[PDB]
């Protein structure tokens, strides 16, 4: 069997572009394409794609469950077995749902978080997508309640592979291949297992300090918001950032992070009360 | 002396398949478990008869840790793409080796924990098991991260403790296989290559373990002599040969010397029609 793959993504906006490639027998060979269970019935009147199939202007008619067969000349049938199925989902057909993290977007390493997708539009199903991932979107049925439709995606136990940017989509009962416009992105950040910083008042500023070479420090108050400062080396091989105190609140926590790992933060420092 | 090793390979192959993770486990030269992310089992599988008595708790626990590794090292391919600024379209390889050595008494001697990216050394736990060797600039970032997570302390505790305790348990459970020594069965072959010269070949077959020394000498002095890599016979034993080209009429001058854990005394082979 061949390997079928959509590039760049099997989730594609109307007007975007996606190319179906059919790797059969060590080359992207000549192949035919098949939709749904019609695997002995090739689409587009039996066209023999020569390299790839680029559907440059994607329409809702492009949506579907595809299979390819590579050309096999010294075979009884001349063609390969049926490939893996690839489901092309076209987006932008409804107005975007909303996506929210419960209890919040900072998730401790080893714990779970709920990514709740919701909308005032009565969506039958919801689709959760981590940006950049080739895997199929997770699918859930939309629970209807008090005039809102909603679905709870459970993510966890939290590791760095699950952190990043998420978007969710809706579909209607009669148009599953047709998805809504994508929701606004939600950044999920895993904290730890990097050792927590120290947070203290300058013997005024709030200092985040660690022997660990964090390159950025993040300050967070219990109310919510986000202040970031670059780490500076000094005072005994310590990497520290001094945050200007300001010239009326308390209970702050600090995290360290490294460059090229934006969604991976240390365990939080102990809570510090600022009078 | 005995050794335990895990070898894992993660490959990206955009357009040719989904990223694939394969891990294999060895005790000395005997493979005993494997995991393949491209399989419907998605479980860690036995590969030697003596490990198949381990209970379901073993197979549940091991599958959990190796599937976790599968997810972790597959994500490490996307991180390496960022560290090195490499295209999403390229194929890349990420390899890991882990394990410990134990002596005859059953005690720790050395531990290992190493990675490579695209065939070149990436990061490695040093010999003392406390610090990291970063090969380039990307690996310095991982080193700084792993110092912050105290990874060396956890692997050190695992390599000196749980790894060694497991090897010790495996060696007793598969003793008759893992602590066997099958001595080399030897033979020599003479083939004329010309009017003035002939090839003398010393053959070693049916040997376990696979550590062996095949050496040729003329009149007693070492003659460094073609030497093939030791190869698996496919039944758990190994094969090797050494060949030298000899002047016609001087075959009696040459001797082949065999050293192996299964031979109480080193073998001396001499040609004889």
């Amino acid at each position: 069997k061949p390997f079928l793959s959509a590039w760049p993504s099997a989730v594609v906006p109307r007007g975007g572009h996606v190319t179906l490639r059919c790797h059969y027998r060590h080359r992207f060979n000549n192949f035919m394409l098949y939709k749904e269970d019609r695997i002995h019935v090739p689409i587009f009147h039996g066209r023999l794609f020569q390299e790839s199939f680029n559907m440059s202007p994607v329409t809702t008619a492009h949506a579907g469950n595809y299979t390819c067969r590579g050309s096999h000349p010294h075979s009884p049938t001349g063609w390969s077995a049926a490939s893996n199925p690839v489901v092309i989902m076209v987006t932008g057909n409804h107005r975007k749902p909303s996506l929210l993290a419960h209890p919040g977007p900072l998730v401790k390493s080893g714990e779970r978080v709920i990514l709740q997708c919701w909308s005032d539009i009565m969506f039958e199903h919801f689709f959760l997508h981590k940006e950049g991932i080739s895997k199929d979107p997770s699918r859930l049925v939309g629970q209807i309640h008090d005039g809102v439709s909603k679905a709870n995606f459970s993510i966890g136990p939290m590791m760095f592979a699950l952190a990043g940017t998420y978007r969710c989509y809706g579909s209607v009962t009669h148009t599953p291949y047709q998805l809504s416009a994508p929701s606004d992105p939600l950044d999920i950040v895993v904290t730890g297992p990097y050792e927590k910083p120290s947070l203290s008042a300058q013997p005024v500023t709030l200092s985040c300090s660690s022997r660990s070479s964090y390159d950025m420090y993040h300050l967070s108050r219990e109310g919510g918001a986000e202040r970031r400062l670059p780490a500076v080396r000094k005072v005994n091989r310590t990497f520290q950032a001094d945050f200007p105190l300001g010239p009326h609140g308390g209970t702050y926590r600090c995290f360290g992070s490294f460059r090229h790992s934006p969604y991976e933060w240390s365990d939080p420092s102990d809570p510090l009360l600022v009078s | 002396s005995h050794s335990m090793r895990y070898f894992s390979t993660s490959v990206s192959r955009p357009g040719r398949g989904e990223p694939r993770f394969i891990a294999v486990g060895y005790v000395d030269d005997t493979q005993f478990v494997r995991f393949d992310s491209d399989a419907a089992s998605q479980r860690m599988e036995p590969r030697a008869p003596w490990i198949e008595q381990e209970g379901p708790e073993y197979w549940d626990e091991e599958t959990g840790k190796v599937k976790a590794h599968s997810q972790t090292d597959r994500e490490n391919l996307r991180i390496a793409l960022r560290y090195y600024n490499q295209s999403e379209a390229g194929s890349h390889t990420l390899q890991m080796m882990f394990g410990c050595d134990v002596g005859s008494d059953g005690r720790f001697l050395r531990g290992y924990h190493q990675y490579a990216y695209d065939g070149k050394d990436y990061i490695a736990l040093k010999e003392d098991l406390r610090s990291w060797t970063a090969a380039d600039m990307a690996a310095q970032i991982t080193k700084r991260k792993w110092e912050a997570a105290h990874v060396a302390e956890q692997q050190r505790a695992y390599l000196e403790g749980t790894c060694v305790d497991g090897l010790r348990r495996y060696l007793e459970n598969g003793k008759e296989t893992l602590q066997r020594t099958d001595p080399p069965k030897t033979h020599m072959t003479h083939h004329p290559i010309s009017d003035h010269e002939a090839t003398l070949r010393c053959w070693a077959l049916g040997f376990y373990p696979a550590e062996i020394t095949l050496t040729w000498q003329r009149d007693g002095e070492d003659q460094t002599t073609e030497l093939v890599e030791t190869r698996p016979a496919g039944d758990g034993t190994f094969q090797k040969w050494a060949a030298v080209v000899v002047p016609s009429g001087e075959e009696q001058r040459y001797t082949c010397h065999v050293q192996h854990e299964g031979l109480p005394k080193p073998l001396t082979l001499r040609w004889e029609p």
Binding site: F160, P193 | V66, H69, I79, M96, K145, A149, D165
Partner: peptide, 8 residues
């Protein structure tokens, strides 16, 4: 026994 593994 299989080791615990960490991200890059």
């Amino acid at each position: 026994r299989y080791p615990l593994t960490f991200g890059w």
